[PDB]
Amino acid sequence: RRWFHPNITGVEAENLLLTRGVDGSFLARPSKSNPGDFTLSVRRNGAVTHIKIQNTGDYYDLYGGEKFATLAELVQYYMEHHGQVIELKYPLNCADPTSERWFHGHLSGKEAEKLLTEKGKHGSFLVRESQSHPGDFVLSVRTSKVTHVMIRCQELKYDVGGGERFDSLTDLVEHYKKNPMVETLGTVLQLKQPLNTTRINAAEIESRVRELSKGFWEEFETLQQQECKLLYSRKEGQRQENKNKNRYKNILPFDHTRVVLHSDYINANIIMPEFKSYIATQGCLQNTVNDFWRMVFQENSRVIVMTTKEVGKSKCVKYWPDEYALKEYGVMRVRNVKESAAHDYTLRELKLSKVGQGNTERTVWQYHFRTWPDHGVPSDPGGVLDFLEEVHHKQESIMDAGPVVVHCSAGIGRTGTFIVIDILIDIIREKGVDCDIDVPKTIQMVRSQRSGMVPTEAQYRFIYMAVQHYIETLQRRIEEEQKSKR
């Protein structure tokens, strides 16, 4: 993601496009006028146009245009499709390495070495600012030893002391990743993966949250710089016969992880924790109700998680019948047995069966979350955690249960937040308080299965807050089992 510039103004973007760019040149930058949103600065007829990209929480909405899952999918679309006519021809690469995984800057010699010893493995690397020589940089690689390679900045160009000269540190790292440096003793300085700083033991969660609260925006931006690596094919969703099956024509499921209906299409993806499964799907459309019940039956889904409220826009269509009423959705029959109302949710006991087959009947428990706000995320994660614990205990109670169907609007915002929290809290529930948990790495893993899961920093912070809250209730529980009470 070279076209994204994290620390530039609107005026700086115009100068960089007029002096170092041409007609068709472009870049992406965070909106300083409205935090959270983004701006697409494109050069046309020797003039710079700034187009607003609204990050609503559910999608990336181009002002007076189309809606997308990620900023990378927006850029990828306009570089090969029509239209705006404004053209996205040449991506203007960023010299700023601040948003990269491997960059640290603030780090020192002994500090980088201590982090590489415990957190690192063979091939772990980092780029830090030089202490003894201001302006220069240091590349520290683990291989079993830690090797330091100086990066000299000579006239805005970077080099290791010999060879090619690069415009940016990202260009230096990317080149030596493909062509690795050879040590004098025949050792190979492999740049396999950057040093993991985000990986933390679930006991030091409160301390990490404290650090990011003074932080969170820096960590989430680093994760957003990885969305170019998740540009998998979405051809099945692009089909003419599948266009109206999509709520948003560009937020499409990945072909390798999509749910194939054995008329085989549905905007849904199977989420597998690649280190309980989930079906991350969009909000039901009036023409996709039949396809939804085909998916629940085929995949043997027993728990449905509705993250959108019942009560001025449509996010999900009533795919279930009224209490005590029975409905036929093509070949599938749904019977609403009982509706249980809690303050945060509504539990609907639905009986799904194939028409003409009584033996195929199973109980599908639909959990309808209502307390979620119209705009933004709640500050207290207690309500969501009590809901997910109830969802997990219902899922665990059923013997032959398939994936948990989770849906919102585009099936990427709330769906992504609810799935990631449930994955992370499942590790803490099974492996106890002492276990390794990585928030952005879990999101990136979920993101490789469905386009842009967890699109906002507020939703990213909410996961950290929900994980911290869940560990605290667990810690208080064990402490209470040891408490003298009367």
From Swiss-Prot:
Disease: LEOPARD syndrome 1: A disorder characterized by lentigines, electrocardiographic conduction abnormalities, ocular hypertelorism, pulmonic stenosis, abnormalities of genitalia, retardation of growth, and sensorineural deafness. Noonan syndrome 1: A form of Noonan syndrome, a disease characterized by short stature, facial dysmorphic features such as hypertelorism, a downward eyeslant and low-set posteriorly rotated ears, and a high incidence of congenital heart defects and hypertrophic cardiomyopathy. Other features can include a short neck with webbing or redundancy of skin, deafness, motor delay, variable intellectual deficits, multiple skeletal defects, cryptorchidism, and bleeding diathesis.
Quaternary data: Interacts with phosphorylated LIME1 and BCAR3. Interacts with SHB and INPP5D/SHIP1. Interacts with MILR1 (tyrosine-phosphorylated). Interacts with FLT1 (tyrosine-phosphorylated), FLT3 (tyrosine-phosphorylated), FLT4 (tyrosine-phosphorylated), KIT and GRB2. Interacts with PDGFRA (tyrosine phosphorylated). Interacts (via SH2 domain) with TEK/TIE2 (tyrosine phosphorylated). Interacts with PTPNS1 and CD84. Interacts with phosphorylated SIT1 and MPZL1. Interacts with FCRL4, FCRL6 and ANKHD1. Interacts with KIR2DL1; the interaction is enhanced by ARRB2. Interacts with GAB2.
Pfam families: SH2, Y_phosphatase
Domain comment in the entry: The SH2 domains repress phosphatase activity. Binding of these domains to phosphotyrosine-containing proteins relieves this auto-inhibition, possibly by inducing a conformational change in the enzyme.
Cellular component terms (Gene Ontology): cytoplasm; cytosol; mitochondrion; nucleoplasm; nucleus; protein-containing complex
Domain SH2: 3-92, 102-195
Active site, per annotation: 408 (phosphocysteine intermediate)
Main location class: cytoplasm
Enzyme class: hydrolase
Family as reported in the entry's similarity comment: Belongs to the protein-tyrosine phosphatase family. Non-receptor class 2 subfamily.
Keyword Acetylation: yes
Enzyme Commission code(s) on record: 3.1.3.48
Modified residues (Phosphotyrosine): 59, 63
Impact when changing residue 234 to Q: In NS1; increases MAPK signaling; increased protein tyrosine phosphatase activity
Effect upon mutating residue 452 to R: In NS1 and JMML; JMML patient also shows growth retardation and pulmonic stenosis
Effect after changing residue 230 to F: In NS1; increases MAPK signaling; increases protein tyrosine phosphatase activity; changed substrate selectivity for GAB1
Catalytic activity: O-phospho-L-tyrosyl-[protein] + H2O = L-tyrosyl-[protein] + phosphate
Residue sites binding substrate per the record: 374, 408-414, 455
Gene Ontology BP annotations: atrioventricular canal development; axonogenesis; Bergmann glial cell differentiation; brain development; cellular response to epidermal growth factor stimulus; cellular response to mechanical stimulus; cerebellar cortex formation; cytokine-mediated signaling pathway
Protein species of origin: Homo sapiens
Superkingdom per UniProt: Eukaryota
Post-translational modification (record): Phosphorylated upon activation of the receptor-type kinase FLT3. Phosphorylated upon activation of the receptor-type kinase PDGFRA. Phosphorylated by activated PDGFRB.
Any one GO MF annotation of this record: protein tyrosine kinase binding
Name of the protein in question: Tyrosine-protein phosphatase non-receptor type 11
Task of the protein: Acts downstream of various receptor and cytoplasmic protein tyrosine kinases to participate in the signal transduction from the cell surface to the nucleus. Positively regulates MAPK signal transduction pathway. Dephosphorylates GAB1, ARHGAP35 and EGFR. Dephosphorylates ROCK2 at 'Tyr-722' resulting in stimulation of its RhoA binding activity. Dephosphorylates CDC73. Dephosphorylates SOX9 on tyrosine residues, leading to inactivate SOX9 and promote ossification. Dephosphorylates tyrosine-phosphorylated NEDD9/CAS-L.
Record-annotated Tyrosine-protein phosphatase domain positions: 216-466
